[PDB]
Write a protein that binds this ligand. Sequence first.
Ligand SMILES: CC(C)(C)OC(=O)c1c(COc2ccc(-c3ccc(CC(=O)O)cc3)cc2)ccc(C(F)(F)F)c1O
Ligand SMILES: CC(C)(C)OC(=O)c1c(COc2ccc(-c3ccc(CC(=O)O)cc3)cc2)ccc(C(F)(F)F)c1O
Lengths: 224, 224, 15, 15
Amino acid sequence: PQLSPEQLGMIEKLVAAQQVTPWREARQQRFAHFTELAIVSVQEIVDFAKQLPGFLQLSREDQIALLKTSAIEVMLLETSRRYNPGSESITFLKDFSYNREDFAKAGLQVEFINPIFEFSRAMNELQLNDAEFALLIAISIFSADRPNVQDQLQVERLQHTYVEALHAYVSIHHPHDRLMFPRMLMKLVSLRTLSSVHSEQVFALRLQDKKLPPLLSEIWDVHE
Amino acid sequence: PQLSPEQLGMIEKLVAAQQVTPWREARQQRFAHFTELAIVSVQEIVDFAKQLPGFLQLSREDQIALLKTSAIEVMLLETSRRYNPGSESITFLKDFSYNREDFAKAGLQVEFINPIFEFSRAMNELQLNDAEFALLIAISIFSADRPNVQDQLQVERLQHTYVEALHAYVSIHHPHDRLMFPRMLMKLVSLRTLSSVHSEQVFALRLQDKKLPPLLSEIWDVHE
Amino acid sequence: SLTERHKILHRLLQE
Amino acid sequence: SLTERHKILHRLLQE
Ligand SMILES: CC(C)(C)OC(=O)c1c(COc2ccc(-c3ccc(CC(=O)O)cc3)cc2)ccc(C(F)(F)F)c1O
Ligand SMILES: CC(C)(C)OC(=O)c1c(COc2ccc(-c3ccc(CC(=O)O)cc3)cc2)ccc(C(F)(F)F)c1O
């Protein structure tokens, strides 16, 4: 698969599209600084999506359906992007690094933390660059199988243009390793499991005395 | 990707590897006939896995970890294979067809049934043959990211040989549609979501008066 | 609709 | 271990 002018420019645009408080009252403040980073991330993901070709042409309702369920997956991709295999930690916003223990003290439970760190380690072995990251994020956003998506067909057709662009990219990036393109997609499989381990997480917070802030509650709390 | 002698024979072998009671006491019997079909299916999946190159060389423990969590996904792939888009129904064992309503009366809840049928419809659009089915099943079985897998590396390396074999196959089957190979893999993404909608299903049965039979309970009930 | 249930997300999308 | 918790599955695997 040769990369086309049209794919070149699309990829370049995505990469360019990607370019808060202190750190048992200490406990509820630590949680708060962490949820604040997520809130920031949601804003970034919206801004990013708005730039994705095809996205704003979908009905607003469909844009909500897509972001609602992809946000955590994009957050997890962004987590694995800033993983350091030396210190087994996550470097959010230049300065503040976070290990499994820091995550625990930030209010998250072990049964979420370990899968987050396993995924990040496995993802770091692939050594993805920005172009690969942006595309995976885009593919994740445009999944036609999210709950309440109306124009599945359009969402799917859109996803495949990003899937193709990835294929052709990885062909220039890894011309001798034809497995790299499928290995990257196989991470979206793992990403779905992580997405529901995050559901078990959200539900467990309900059971303790820990309320998600407004935006996060809006995307993640099930309200009935 | 040209298909090799070694891949040819491997695919052929998989395809060859794939070649009970009547139908509110009526209610608990209907449930029972359905769970009996699953029990049969588990046996088939074990037999199938035993034939997969590399499988029996993994520690028994790892073989359990793989089958434990892949069984439902293989079951769902086998579900989508026998979907009829005319009658929107599933033809298990030649004779007995099952629609959404039949599934409901078999004890399953709506919130599982609709995603099962959406996936089957979406899967039927791809029109997979046996070779494509067998390979997807194999890839699903050898996922290194299942809980409690020891030799992730070996499980992964094994998965990639099946991923490659699929790639090369689909290249002969669909020589003008380079999207077909990734579209098939993107179904394993959806398969993971389905796998946990099935978790919500298992949990809901606990809440009503409905016990899974011995084998199924063993793979699906969380015991603590 | 989802839109009526996701005000903050909607408002982020409108700017 | 998983093996001790999955007797029927183990037994299917042994035949
Ligand atoms: C994704 C991760 C596992 C880390 O976090 C959660 O899932 C999670 C969090 C905090 O989320 C964050 C944390 C940090 C970032 C982030 C990502 C990229 C940049 C850009 C840069 O660094 O330049 C900056 C910050 C995103 C999401 C809180 C509460 C819950 C709660 F469980 F409470 F819901 C959570 O699940
Ligand atoms: C996969 C499906 C959604 C259909 O079923 C379940 O998940 C499910 C079931 C019955 O499962 C079956 C049903 C039928 C077959 C089957 C597949 C292929 C052949 C080969 C051929 O036809 O030749 C024959 C039978 C497999 C699994 C019961 C209870 C629960 C419970 F929720 F109760 F756990 C379930 O979840």
